[PDB]
């Protein structure tokens, strides 16, 4: 923990103490976990401290040992307040910016919020410019593929009204609907079957000792 003149102050809920006001290039490094003070603001769930971005905190990577930016942390923890504060910070409108940033697992802020069913964070994100159809690198799943895997019906109807392409496949060439087979939720295979392309609905049938989807 290569703590800075703020971690301790941060971890410890303090006033100006945990908010030294200055106002070699004033900055805040990160511990052995690669956490910048701002990450602690989110983890610790104290928006105000984050509210005080002050010197543009880590504007490029600003990541952790898992590859998360503060906003990523806010989205998997589910703190609406932080998503709210960490969003005004005029940097995300840039290129590559957070709304498109991914941790070492290729997860977007949208992905993390979908994984934990935070329907409200998912909505705010897409509203601010997140690609509801962004794909994750392991298998190319979109948040809609994950909602089906997570068997979250509330989540899937919400990705539908946000623009999620019911079609669009995985590296294995499967639509979110093709992932319902073998799972419980009839409600999920009902709100997707209809929408999904006719030939993106059934599963491959033992073809030529392999059986690929083709894409």
């Amino acid at each position: 923990d290569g703590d800075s003149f703020l971690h301790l102050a941060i971890i410890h809920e303090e006033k100006a103490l945990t908010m030294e006001v200055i106002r070699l290039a004033f900055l805040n490094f990160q511990n052995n976990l690669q956490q910048t003070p701002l990450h602690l603001a989110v983890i610790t769930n104290q928006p105000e401290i984050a509210e005080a971005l002050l010197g543009a905190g880590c504007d490029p990577e600003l990541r952790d040992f898992r590859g998360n930016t503060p906003l990523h942390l806010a989205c998997e923890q589910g703190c609406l307040a932080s998503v709210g504060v960490l969003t005004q910070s005029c940097t995300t409108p840039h290129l590559h910016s957070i709304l498109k940033a991914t941790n070492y697992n290729g997860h977007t802020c949208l992905h993390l919020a979908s994984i934990h069913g935070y329907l409200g964070i998912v909505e705010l994100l897409v509203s601010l410019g997140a690609d509801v159809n962004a794909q994750e690198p392991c298998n190319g799943r979109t948040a809609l593929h994950l909602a089906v895997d997570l068997q979250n019906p509330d989540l899937v109807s919400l990705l539908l009204k946000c623009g999620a392409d019911v079609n669009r496949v995985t590296y294995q060439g499967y639509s979110p609907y093709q992932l319902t087979w073998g799972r419980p939720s009839t409600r999920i295979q009902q709100q997707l079957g209809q929408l999904t392309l006719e030939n993106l609905q059934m599963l491959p049938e033992s073809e030529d000792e392999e059986s690929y989807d083709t894409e």
Partner: protein
């Protein structure tokens, strides 16, 4: 104005039997059937509700869906298929009774005779589109639903095919070869790649047994990669506030026969230090 199967039948597990022995005793289970909970082949009509009929015949697995020599048996069944009135009060129609009676190749030339006799050919294919290659290993149920025209004509809806249902193979040896992960959070949700010998995707699962505990790994039939690998997520352990790691058993389980592979140790753990990117005890 269409029929959609809401509950496909269980594919693997059921053994096609012959008439000589007897009729049967058990019917085609639904896809979502567990060794304790029962379900059945269920359909649902759209844009319509009221009087009508439903015909259910057998047909091949392969594209040229020719009638099949096997003959559904049980109630409301005759000549080889099923046919009964449609309850007018509901739009969902389940079949709690249906049996696949198989024909002996020595008399398969007779079964097909009758098929065209009673002209039981849902997709009506020509007599030249009825070759001699009959995959007696499988079959598919065909749903011929009939109703009324918005006027008066008896509207015959499009025949909907179910997932092929297969016969008795047994016997294979479930073997887990490699597992990229044998440890994860007690809150479950960990993705695990498991390499195994050949398995069938409609008849396989990852059975996590403990002392007085038992759960299943979460994954879709599509997560079974070419019969030799399975990508799934771990179920939550009994104790979600675990303070000390706990070893648990993890194995392959074939539902149709309860067969289980050799157990592989799996160690649940608490979220302790990871659950908050480490903080306590600074």
């Amino acid at each position: 104005p269409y029929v959609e199967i809401i509950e496909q039948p269980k594919q693997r597990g059921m053994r096609f039997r012959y008439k000589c022995e007897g009729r049967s005793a058990g019917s085609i289970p639904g896809e979502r059937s567990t060794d304790t909970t029962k379900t059945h082949p269920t359909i649902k009509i759209n844009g319509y509700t009221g009087p009508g009929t439903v015909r259910i015949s057998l047909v091949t697995k392969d594209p040229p869906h020719r009638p099949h020599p096997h003959e559904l048996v049980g109630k409301d069944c005759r000549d080889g298929y099923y046919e009964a009135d449609l309850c007018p009060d509901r739009s969902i129609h389940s079949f709690q009774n249906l049996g696949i009676q198989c024909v002996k190749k020595r008399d398969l030339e007779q079964a097909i005779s009758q098929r065209i006799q009673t002209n039981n050919n849902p997709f009506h294919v020509p007599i030249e589109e009825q070759r001699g290659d009959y995959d007696l290993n499988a079959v598919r149920l065909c749903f011929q639903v009939t109703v009324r025209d918005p006027a008066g004509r008896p509207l015959l809806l499009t025949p909907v095919l179910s997932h092929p249902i297969f016969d008795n193979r047994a016997t294979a040896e479930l073997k887990i070869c490699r597992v990229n992960r044998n440890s994860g959070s007690c809150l479950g949700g960990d993705e695990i790649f498991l390499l195994c010998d050949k398995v069938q995707k409609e008849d396989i699962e990852v059975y996590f047994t403990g002392p007085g505990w038992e759960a299943r790994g979460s994954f879709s039939q599509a997560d079974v990669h070419r019969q030799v690998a399975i990508v799934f997520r771990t179920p939550p352990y009994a104790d979600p506030s675990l303070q000390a790691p706990v070893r648990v058993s993890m194995q392959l389980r074939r539902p149709s026969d309860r067969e289980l592979s050799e157990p592989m140790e799996f160690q649940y753990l608490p979220d302790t230090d990871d659950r908050h990117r480490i903080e306590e005890k600074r």
